[PDB]
PDB file of C-alpha atoms in Angstrom:
ATOM      1  CA  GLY A   1      -4.303-154.146  14.306  1.00 56.34           C
ATOM      2  CA  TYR A   2      -7.812-155.278  14.219  1.00 53.15           C
ATOM      3  CA  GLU A   3      -9.854-156.914  16.854  1.00 55.25           C
ATOM      4  CA  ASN A   4     -12.976-159.261  16.047  1.00 52.80           C
ATOM      5  CA  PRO A   5     -15.606-158.166  18.386  1.00 56.91           C
ATOM      6  CA  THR A   6     -16.898-161.519  17.898  1.00 59.34           C
ATOM      7  CA  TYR A   7     -14.178-163.774  19.100  1.00 60.15           C
ATOM      8  CA  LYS A   8     -15.002-162.755  22.921  1.00 59.03           C
ATOM      9  CA  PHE A   9     -18.592-164.184  22.420  1.00 58.46           C
ATOM     10  CA  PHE A  10     -17.494-167.770  22.072  1.00 59.02           C
TER      11      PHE A  10
ATOM     12  CA  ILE B   1     -11.333-162.933  -1.598  1.00 52.92           C
ATOM     13  CA  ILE B   2      -8.053-164.550  -2.267  1.00 53.90           C
ATOM     14  CA  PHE B   3      -4.509-162.802  -1.850  1.00 54.48           C
ATOM     15  CA  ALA B   4      -1.087-164.591  -1.941  1.00 57.28           C
ATOM     16  CA  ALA B   5       1.800-164.372   0.918  1.00 54.69           C
ATOM     17  CA  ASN B   6       4.566-166.655   2.005  1.00 57.93           C
ATOM     18  CA  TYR B   7       3.904-168.765   5.151  1.00 56.57           C
ATOM     19  CA  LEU B   8       6.622-167.958   7.526  1.00 55.40           C
ATOM     20  CA  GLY B   9       6.048-169.461  11.234  1.00 57.01           C
ATOM     21  CA  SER B  10       3.992-169.688  13.764  1.00 58.27           C
ATOM     22  CA  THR B  11       4.176-169.387  17.663  1.00 58.64           C
ATOM     23  CA  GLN B  12       1.853-169.992  20.579  1.00 58.25           C
ATOM     24  CA  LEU B  13       0.273-168.108  23.539  1.00 59.34           C
ATOM     25  CA  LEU B  14      -1.513-170.062  26.492  1.00 60.92           C
ATOM     26  CA  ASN B  15      -2.396-152.896  24.012  1.00 62.23           C
ATOM     27  CA  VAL B  16      -1.210-156.041  25.109  1.00 62.85           C
ATOM     28  CA  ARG B  17      -2.317-158.021  22.121  1.00 63.18           C
ATOM     29  CA  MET B  18      -0.619-155.641  20.002  1.00 65.14           C
ATOM     30  CA  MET B  19       2.268-156.350  21.628  1.00 63.62           C
ATOM     31  CA  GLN B  20       1.953-160.043  21.351  1.00 65.59           C
ATOM     32  CA  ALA B  21       1.462-159.720  17.623  1.00 64.10           C
ATOM     33  CA  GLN B  22       4.918-158.077  17.858  1.00 67.08           C
ATOM     34  CA  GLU B  23       6.733-160.524  20.108  1.00 68.49           C
ATOM     35  CA  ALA B  24       5.442-163.201  17.312  1.00 67.46           C
ATOM     36  CA  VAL B  25       6.735-161.180  14.596  1.00 68.39           C
ATOM     37  CA  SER B  26      10.239-161.100  15.882  1.00 70.11           C
ATOM     38  CA  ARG B  27      10.226-164.470  17.037  1.00 71.05           C
ATOM     39  CA  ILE B  28       9.541-165.773  13.634  1.00 72.87           C
ATOM     40  CA  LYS B  29      12.286-163.418  12.062  1.00 76.49           C
ATOM     41  CA  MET B  30      14.739-164.845  14.521  1.00 76.05           C
ATOM     42  CA  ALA B  31      13.486-168.129  13.225  1.00 74.68           C
ATOM     43  CA  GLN B  32      14.292-167.220   9.832  1.00 73.19           C
ATOM     44  CA  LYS B  33      17.651-165.767  10.163  1.00 73.12           C
ATOM     45  CA  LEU B  34      18.849-168.956  11.968  1.00 70.15           C
ATOM     46  CA  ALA B  35      17.521-171.414   9.155  1.00 70.60           C
ATOM     47  CA  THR B  36       6.484-171.640   1.688  1.00 68.62           C
ATOM     48  CA  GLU B  37       4.130-170.013  -0.933  1.00 67.88           C
ATOM     49  CA  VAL B  38       0.626-170.013  -0.035  1.00 67.38           C
ATOM     50  CA  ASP B  39      -2.761-168.126  -0.868  1.00 66.18           C
ATOM     51  CA  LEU B  40      -5.203-166.833   1.747  1.00 63.61           C
ATOM     52  CA  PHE B  41      -9.360-167.167   1.006  1.00 62.55           C
ATOM     53  CA  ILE B  42     -10.748-164.648   3.474  1.00 61.21           C
ATOM     54  CA  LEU B  43     -14.520-164.958   3.916  1.00 61.75           C
ATOM     55  CA  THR B  44     -17.140-163.878   6.578  1.00 59.49           C
ATOM     56  CA  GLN B  45     -17.381-167.368   7.534  1.00 55.23           C
ATOM     57  CA  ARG B  46     -13.511-168.432   7.854  1.00 50.11           C
ATOM     58  CA  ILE B  47     -10.019-167.761   6.967  1.00 49.44           C
ATOM     59  CA  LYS B  48      -8.469-170.654   4.902  1.00 47.55           C
ATOM     60  CA  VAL B  49      -4.580-170.699   4.082  1.00 48.71           C
ATOM     61  CA  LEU B  50      -3.662-173.208   1.502  1.00 49.00           C
ATOM     62  CA  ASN B  51      -0.554-174.466  -0.081  1.00 48.80           C
ATOM     63  CA  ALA B  52      -0.262-172.454  -3.319  1.00 50.53           C
ATOM     64  CA  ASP B  53       1.106-175.392  -5.734  1.00 49.00           C
ATOM     65  CA  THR B  54      -0.831-178.523  -4.208  1.00 48.89           C
ATOM     66  CA  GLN B  55      -3.965-176.378  -3.225  1.00 47.39           C
ATOM     67  CA  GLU B  56      -4.075-178.567  -0.026  1.00 45.33           C
ATOM     68  CA  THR B  57      -5.637-176.725   3.216  1.00 47.47           C
ATOM     69  CA  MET B  58      -2.751-176.036   5.569  1.00 50.05           C
ATOM     70  CA  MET B  59      -5.124-174.431   8.273  1.00 51.05           C
ATOM     71  CA  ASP B  60      -8.805-173.620   8.372  1.00 50.64           C
ATOM     72  CA  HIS B  61     -10.120-171.103  10.857  1.00 50.96           C
ATOM     73  CA  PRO B  62     -13.565-170.520  11.838  1.00 51.28           C
ATOM     74  CA  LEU B  63     -13.833-166.679  11.632  1.00 50.85           C
ATOM     75  CA  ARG B  64     -15.259-166.872  15.128  1.00 51.15           C
ATOM     76  CA  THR B  65     -12.094-168.448  16.465  1.00 47.20           C
ATOM     77  CA  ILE B  66      -9.637-165.881  15.525  1.00 47.22           C
ATOM     78  CA  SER B  67      -9.117-162.564  17.407  1.00 48.20           C
ATOM     79  CA  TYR B  68      -6.428-160.323  16.121  1.00 48.60           C
ATOM     80  CA  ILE B  69      -5.183-159.524  12.696  1.00 49.79           C
ATOM     81  CA  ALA B  70      -1.882-157.317  12.427  1.00 47.69           C
ATOM     82  CA  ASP B  71      -0.116-155.611   9.414  1.00 49.23           C
ATOM     83  CA  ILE B  72       3.498-155.026  10.521  1.00 52.72           C
ATOM     84  CA  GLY B  73       5.322-153.805   7.743  1.00 51.03           C
ATOM     85  CA  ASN B  74       4.794-156.412   4.766  1.00 53.81           C
ATOM     86  CA  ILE B  75       4.371-158.909   7.574  1.00 55.88           C
ATOM     87  CA  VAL B  76       0.827-160.555   8.762  1.00 57.62           C
ATOM     88  CA  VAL B  77       0.097-161.830  12.154  1.00 57.95           C
ATOM     89  CA  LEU B  78      -2.901-164.176  12.308  1.00 57.15           C
ATOM     90  CA  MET B  79      -4.002-164.860  16.107  1.00 58.27           C
ATOM     91  CA  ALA B  80      -6.746-167.513  16.686  1.00 56.54           C
ATOM     92  CA  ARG B  81      -7.505-169.745  19.670  1.00 55.51           C
ATOM     93  CA  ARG B  82      -7.199-173.412  20.315  1.00 56.47           C
ATOM     94  CA  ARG B  83      -3.946-174.909  18.714  1.00 56.68           C
ATOM     95  CA  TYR B  84      -6.089-169.327  26.095  1.00 58.37           C
ATOM     96  CA  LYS B  85      -4.146-171.914  23.937  1.00 59.54           C
ATOM     97  CA  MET B  86      -3.967-169.749  20.915  1.00 61.37           C
ATOM     98  CA  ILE B  87      -1.718-169.677  17.742  1.00 61.70           C
ATOM     99  CA  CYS B  88      -0.140-166.977  15.769  1.00 62.33           C
ATOM    100  CA  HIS B  89       0.649-167.341  12.061  1.00 62.56           C
ATOM    101  CA  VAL B  90       3.149-165.246  10.418  1.00 58.75           C
ATOM    102  CA  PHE B  91       2.975-164.365   6.855  1.00 56.54           C
ATOM    103  CA  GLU B  92       5.045-162.184   4.537  1.00 59.18           C
ATOM    104  CA  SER B  93       2.797-160.638   2.107  1.00 60.97           C
ATOM    105  CA  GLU B  94       3.279-157.876  -1.033  1.00 64.27           C
ATOM    106  CA  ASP B  95      -0.115-156.763   0.431  1.00 63.95           C
ATOM    107  CA  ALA B  96      -0.187-157.252   4.251  1.00 63.82           C
ATOM    108  CA  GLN B  97      -2.095-153.947   4.971  1.00 67.06           C
ATOM    109  CA  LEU B  98      -4.731-155.003   2.133  1.00 63.80           C
ATOM    110  CA  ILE B  99      -4.981-158.520   3.956  1.00 65.17           C
ATOM    111  CA  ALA B 100      -5.311-157.222   7.366  1.00 66.27           C
ATOM    112  CA  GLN B 101      -7.779-154.499   6.023  1.00 68.17           C
ATOM    113  CA  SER B 102      -9.944-157.149   4.426  1.00 67.18           C
ATOM    114  CA  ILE B 103      -9.866-159.628   7.449  1.00 69.95           C
ATOM    115  CA  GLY B 104     -10.986-156.619   9.387  1.00 70.20           C
ATOM    116  CA  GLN B 105     -14.053-156.210   6.973  1.00 67.52           C
ATOM    117  CA  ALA B 106     -14.865-159.826   7.401  1.00 65.85           C
ATOM    118  CA  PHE B 107     -15.013-159.385  11.028  1.00 66.57           C
ATOM    119  CA  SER B 108     -17.291-156.184  11.041  1.00 64.67           C
ATOM    120  CA  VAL B 109     -19.775-158.295   8.276  1.00 62.94           C
ATOM    121  CA  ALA B 110     -19.328-161.425  10.611  1.00 60.40           C
ATOM    122  CA  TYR B 111     -20.417-159.349  13.565  1.00 60.44           C
ATOM    123  CA  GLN B 112     -23.106-157.883  12.119  1.00 65.01           C
ATOM    124  CA  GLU B 113     -24.421-161.313  11.317  1.00 65.28           C
ATOM    125  CA  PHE B 114     -23.744-162.290  14.838  1.00 67.76           C
ATOM    126  CA  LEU B 115     -25.709-159.407  16.256  1.00 67.86           C
ATOM    127  CA  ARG B 116     -28.665-160.519  13.980  1.00 65.84           C
ATOM    128  CA  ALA B 117     -28.516-163.994  15.358  1.00 66.58           C
ATOM    129  CA  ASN B 118     -28.881-162.919  19.175  1.00 65.70           C
ATOM    130  CA  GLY B 119     -32.084-160.927  17.866  1.00 64.89           C
ATOM    131  CA  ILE B 120     -30.019-157.658  18.055  1.00 65.75           C
ATOM    132  CA  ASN B 121     -30.317-155.179  15.074  1.00 70.53           C
ATOM    133  CA  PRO B 122     -26.816-153.928  13.820  1.00 68.92           C
TER     134      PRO B 122
ATOM    135  CA  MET C   1     -12.389-123.564 -16.843  1.00 69.51           C
ATOM    136  CA  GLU C   2     -13.875-127.059 -16.174  1.00 69.25           C
ATOM    137  CA  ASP C   3     -15.810-127.766 -12.939  1.00 69.39           C
ATOM    138  CA  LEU C   4     -17.502-131.121 -11.920  1.00 68.70           C
ATOM    139  CA  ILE C   5     -20.634-130.289 -14.020  1.00 68.13           C
ATOM    140  CA  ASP C   6     -18.540-129.982 -17.234  1.00 71.01           C
ATOM    141  CA  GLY C   7     -16.459-132.884 -16.255  1.00 70.57           C
ATOM    142  CA  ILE C   8     -13.158-133.231 -14.966  1.00 70.03           C
ATOM    143  CA  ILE C   9     -10.159-135.435 -15.712  1.00 69.53           C
ATOM    144  CA  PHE C  10      -7.521-138.068 -13.623  1.00 70.65           C
ATOM    145  CA  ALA C  11      -4.924-140.065 -15.180  1.00 70.46           C
ATOM    146  CA  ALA C  12      -5.312-143.922 -14.251  1.00 70.81           C
ATOM    147  CA  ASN C  13      -4.445-147.479 -15.597  1.00 69.51           C
ATOM    148  CA  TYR C  14      -7.285-149.718 -15.961  1.00 69.71           C
ATOM    149  CA  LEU C  15      -6.492-152.775 -14.407  1.00 67.30           C
ATOM    150  CA  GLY C  16      -9.235-155.223 -15.568  1.00 65.58           C
ATOM    151  CA  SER C  17     -12.854-155.682 -14.462  1.00 67.10           C
ATOM    152  CA  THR C  18     -15.089-158.265 -12.248  1.00 64.77           C
ATOM    153  CA  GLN C  19     -18.428-159.441 -11.283  1.00 62.24           C
ATOM    154  CA  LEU C  20     -20.713-160.296  -8.447  1.00 62.95           C
ATOM    155  CA  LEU C  21     -23.971-160.822  -7.320  1.00 65.28           C
ATOM    156  CA  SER C  22     -24.978-158.470  -4.457  1.00 66.62           C
ATOM    157  CA  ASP C  23     -28.311-157.520  -2.632  1.00 69.07           C
ATOM    158  CA  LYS C  24     -29.824-154.007  -3.840  1.00 68.77           C
ATOM    159  CA  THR C  25     -28.637-151.788  -1.325  1.00 71.06           C
ATOM    160  CA  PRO C  26     -25.906-153.599   0.969  1.00 73.25           C
ATOM    161  CA  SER C  27     -24.220-152.069   4.039  1.00 73.71           C
ATOM    162  CA  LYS C  28     -20.993-150.088   3.467  1.00 72.96           C
ATOM    163  CA  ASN C  29     -18.744-153.111   5.316  1.00 71.29           C
ATOM    164  CA  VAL C  30     -19.935-155.811   3.159  1.00 73.98           C
ATOM    165  CA  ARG C  31     -19.708-153.191   0.064  1.00 73.47           C
ATOM    166  CA  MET C  32     -16.041-152.787   1.185  1.00 69.71           C
ATOM    167  CA  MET C  33     -15.628-156.568   1.133  1.00 69.04           C
ATOM    168  CA  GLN C  34     -17.027-156.470  -2.408  1.00 70.08           C
ATOM    169  CA  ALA C  35     -14.649-153.827  -3.506  1.00 70.15           C
ATOM    170  CA  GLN C  36     -11.657-155.641  -2.014  1.00 70.00           C
ATOM    171  CA  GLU C  37     -12.685-158.763  -3.732  1.00 71.67           C
ATOM    172  CA  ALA C  38     -12.553-157.289  -7.244  1.00 74.87           C
ATOM    173  CA  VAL C  39      -8.967-155.941  -6.357  1.00 75.45           C
ATOM    174  CA  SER C  40      -8.293-159.400  -5.540  1.00 75.37           C
ATOM    175  CA  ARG C  41      -9.343-161.043  -8.475  1.00 77.39           C
ATOM    176  CA  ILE C  42      -7.662-158.658 -10.421  1.00 78.55           C
ATOM    177  CA  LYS C  43      -4.499-158.710  -8.528  1.00 76.54           C
ATOM    178  CA  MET C  44      -4.281-162.611  -8.648  1.00 76.19           C
ATOM    179  CA  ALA C  45      -4.646-162.401 -12.402  1.00 75.60           C
ATOM    180  CA  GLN C  46      -1.501-160.012 -12.619  1.00 71.21           C
ATOM    181  CA  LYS C  47       0.401-162.570 -10.976  1.00 69.94           C
ATOM    182  CA  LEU C  48      -0.702-165.504 -12.305  1.00 71.78           C
ATOM    183  CA  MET C  49      -2.444-151.851 -17.795  1.00 70.94           C
ATOM    184  CA  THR C  50      -2.232-149.346 -20.500  1.00 73.54           C
ATOM    185  CA  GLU C  51      -2.983-145.805 -19.512  1.00 76.17           C
ATOM    186  CA  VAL C  52      -6.462-144.090 -19.399  1.00 76.97           C
ATOM    187  CA  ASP C  53      -8.053-140.579 -18.593  1.00 76.26           C
ATOM    188  CA  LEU C  54     -11.029-140.912 -16.049  1.00 74.18           C
ATOM    189  CA  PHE C  55     -13.794-138.532 -16.903  1.00 71.20           C
ATOM    190  CA  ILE C  56     -16.159-137.660 -13.580  1.00 70.36           C
ATOM    191  CA  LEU C  57     -18.987-135.226 -13.859  1.00 68.68           C
ATOM    192  CA  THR C  58     -22.201-135.021 -12.107  1.00 70.97           C
ATOM    193  CA  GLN C  59     -23.966-136.878 -15.177  1.00 69.04           C
ATOM    194  CA  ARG C  60     -21.546-139.812 -15.943  1.00 71.38           C
ATOM    195  CA  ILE C  61     -18.326-141.919 -15.864  1.00 71.41           C
ATOM    196  CA  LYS C  62     -16.002-141.971 -18.885  1.00 68.33           C
ATOM    197  CA  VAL C  63     -12.932-143.651 -19.577  1.00 67.09           C
ATOM    198  CA  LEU C  64     -11.016-142.237 -22.400  1.00 64.60           C
ATOM    199  CA  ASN C  65      -7.519-144.114 -23.684  1.00 66.06           C
ATOM    200  CA  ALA C  66      -4.918-141.743 -22.659  1.00 66.15           C
ATOM    201  CA  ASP C  67      -3.201-141.762 -26.133  1.00 69.70           C
ATOM    202  CA  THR C  68      -6.097-141.673 -28.892  1.00 70.48           C
ATOM    203  CA  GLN C  69      -8.757-140.151 -26.648  1.00 67.08           C
ATOM    204  CA  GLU C  70     -11.259-142.531 -27.893  1.00 66.88           C
ATOM    205  CA  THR C  71     -14.104-143.333 -25.667  1.00 66.42           C
ATOM    206  CA  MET C  72     -13.568-146.622 -24.296  1.00 65.76           C
ATOM    207  CA  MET C  73     -16.003-146.635 -21.304  1.00 67.57           C
ATOM    208  CA  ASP C  74     -19.096-144.404 -20.640  1.00 63.35           C
ATOM    209  CA  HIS C  75     -21.712-144.893 -17.747  1.00 64.04           C
ATOM    210  CA  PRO C  76     -24.533-142.874 -16.851  1.00 64.56           C
ATOM    211  CA  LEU C  77     -23.998-141.935 -13.174  1.00 64.29           C
ATOM    212  CA  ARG C  78     -27.292-143.788 -12.486  1.00 67.59           C
ATOM    213  CA  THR C  79     -25.779-147.182 -13.366  1.00 66.95           C
ATOM    214  CA  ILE C  80     -22.770-146.576 -10.827  1.00 65.83           C
ATOM    215  CA  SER C  81     -23.930-148.057  -7.144  1.00 64.58           C
ATOM    216  CA  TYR C  82     -20.809-147.580  -5.296  1.00 63.75           C
ATOM    217  CA  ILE C  83     -16.942-146.272  -5.693  1.00 62.27           C
ATOM    218  CA  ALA C  84     -14.192-147.190  -3.442  1.00 64.21           C
ATOM    219  CA  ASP C  85     -10.567-146.219  -3.264  1.00 63.44           C
ATOM    220  CA  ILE C  86      -8.213-149.203  -2.082  1.00 64.33           C
ATOM    221  CA  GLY C  87      -4.768-147.797  -1.535  1.00 61.34           C
ATOM    222  CA  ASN C  88      -3.972-146.291  -5.018  1.00 59.81           C
ATOM    223  CA  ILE C  89      -6.458-148.548  -6.347  1.00 61.45           C
ATOM    224  CA  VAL C  90     -10.012-147.505  -7.582  1.00 61.19           C
ATOM    225  CA  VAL C  91     -12.958-149.940  -7.989  1.00 61.58           C
ATOM    226  CA  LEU C  92     -16.297-148.517  -9.843  1.00 62.53           C
ATOM    227  CA  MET C  93     -19.302-151.051  -9.485  1.00 61.04           C
ATOM    228  CA  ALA C  94     -22.144-150.656 -11.900  1.00 59.94           C
ATOM    229  CA  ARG C  95     -25.464-152.334 -12.623  1.00 58.84           C
ATOM    230  CA  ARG C  96     -26.865-154.277 -15.709  1.00 58.02           C
ATOM    231  CA  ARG C  97     -26.446-158.396 -16.232  1.00 53.47           C
ATOM    232  CA  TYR C  98     -28.143-158.801  -8.772  1.00 55.64           C
ATOM    233  CA  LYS C  99     -25.214-159.177 -10.986  1.00 56.75           C
ATOM    234  CA  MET C 100     -22.865-156.056 -10.541  1.00 55.60           C
ATOM    235  CA  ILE C 101     -19.862-155.251 -12.618  1.00 57.09           C
ATOM    236  CA  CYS C 102     -16.778-153.889 -11.539  1.00 59.06           C
ATOM    237  CA  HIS C 103     -13.915-151.939 -13.218  1.00 62.09           C
ATOM    238  CA  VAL C 104     -10.924-151.570 -11.165  1.00 60.63           C
ATOM    239  CA  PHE C 105      -7.955-148.610 -12.013  1.00 63.38           C
ATOM    240  CA  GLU C 106      -4.865-147.792 -10.451  1.00 64.68           C
ATOM    241  CA  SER C 107      -4.041-144.073  -9.764  1.00 62.26           C
ATOM    242  CA  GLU C 108      -2.141-141.739  -7.535  1.00 67.06           C
ATOM    243  CA  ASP C 109      -5.217-139.761  -7.540  1.00 67.94           C
ATOM    244  CA  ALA C 110      -7.564-142.686  -6.376  1.00 71.34           C
ATOM    245  CA  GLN C 111      -8.637-140.601  -3.229  1.00 69.96           C
ATOM    246  CA  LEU C 112      -9.592-137.733  -5.136  1.00 66.48           C
ATOM    247  CA  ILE C 113     -11.412-139.808  -7.840  1.00 68.58           C
ATOM    248  CA  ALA C 114     -13.690-141.043  -5.216  1.00 68.72           C
ATOM    249  CA  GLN C 115     -14.215-137.472  -3.892  1.00 66.56           C
ATOM    250  CA  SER C 116     -15.147-136.625  -6.952  1.00 65.97           C
ATOM    251  CA  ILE C 117     -17.514-139.475  -7.803  1.00 64.99           C
ATOM    252  CA  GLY C 118     -19.051-139.023  -4.231  1.00 68.44           C
ATOM    253  CA  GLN C 119     -19.523-135.342  -4.772  1.00 68.08           C
ATOM    254  CA  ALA C 120     -21.144-136.196  -8.129  1.00 69.95           C
ATOM    255  CA  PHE C 121     -23.390-138.704  -6.222  1.00 64.24           C
ATOM    256  CA  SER C 122     -24.609-136.079  -3.972  1.00 65.47           C
ATOM    257  CA  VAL C 123     -25.302-133.451  -6.584  1.00 66.63           C
ATOM    258  CA  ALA C 124     -27.201-135.949  -8.656  1.00 64.51           C
ATOM    259  CA  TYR C 125     -29.160-137.384  -5.651  1.00 67.10           C
ATOM    260  CA  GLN C 126     -30.315-133.789  -4.359  1.00 63.35           C
ATOM    261  CA  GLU C 127     -31.264-132.766  -8.055  1.00 63.62           C
ATOM    262  CA  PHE C 128     -33.554-136.117  -7.863  1.00 64.35           C
ATOM    263  CA  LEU C 129     -34.967-135.146  -4.277  1.00 65.62           C
ATOM    264  CA  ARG C 130     -35.966-131.689  -5.137  1.00 66.21           C
TER     265      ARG C 130
ATOM    266  CA  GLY D   1     -15.826-145.554  -0.704  1.00 66.75           C
ATOM    267  CA  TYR D   2     -19.134-144.241  -1.387  1.00 64.19           C
ATOM    268  CA  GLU D   3     -22.649-145.434  -2.416  1.00 61.67           C
ATOM    269  CA  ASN D   4     -24.898-143.755  -5.035  1.00 63.02           C
ATOM    270  CA  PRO D   5     -27.880-142.745  -3.195  1.00 64.43           C
ATOM    271  CA  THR D   6     -29.900-142.300  -6.337  1.00 68.28           C
ATOM    272  CA  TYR D   7     -28.906-145.866  -8.010  1.00 70.78           C
ATOM    273  CA  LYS D   8     -31.750-147.796  -5.978  1.00 71.13           C
ATOM    274  CA  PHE D   9     -35.057-145.796  -7.794  1.00 67.54           C
ATOM    275  CA  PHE D  10     -33.797-147.224 -11.223  1.00 63.07           C
TER     276      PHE D  10
END
């Protein structure tokens, strides 16, 4: 599985 | 980058995330066993899933609102916000692993671009 | 015996080629998105492959037709900017046409092919330095 | 995959 490090910033 | 897959279904949510992807797959699987062809445009800006024969946009997700992608066998779980009020689209694909690897690269690139925007050198 | 200096060969299936505009020296992740892209365009075309021998060495990349052994592709290692193995798929990106040219192959030796080209890279770049 | 370090000076 891949987590988008950018999602949590918005 | 465009890949082909079959839109199976979607679930909603309001190591744990890996599980959530799982619950979503099962949910969809039970859906199928009780009862359309698309093409996926992957980009640093967004993920666009369209109806294959028509070419009408089914879902248009701005990459920033997507958090998780998983390849569970030949299945693909696309988890995105607002629709913390998230939605999970499940697709069956010949190349589910390639699709997830590609979205992950999009994540990596857009994140680099993210840091650059905030004055941070990636 | 044949080493990497003479050139070593791997069986592969040519799938087709594509193109793109890329910055001169992109980051690795963006360079993977390029490879993945070539593979995408290739596959969509295969839904909407005759055998070859891949010749790799410190001096050039060649593709001979598995049967006739006629040279089908020959590229100076200089013109090759990146190479990647995506599963059993191999993506070879070159210069000249910035516009880049991508040849896509399929092989059970994709991982060994990439290794081999990267090592070719190393050999040629250090030669250049000294 | 790998990047050819030499490719740039040409």
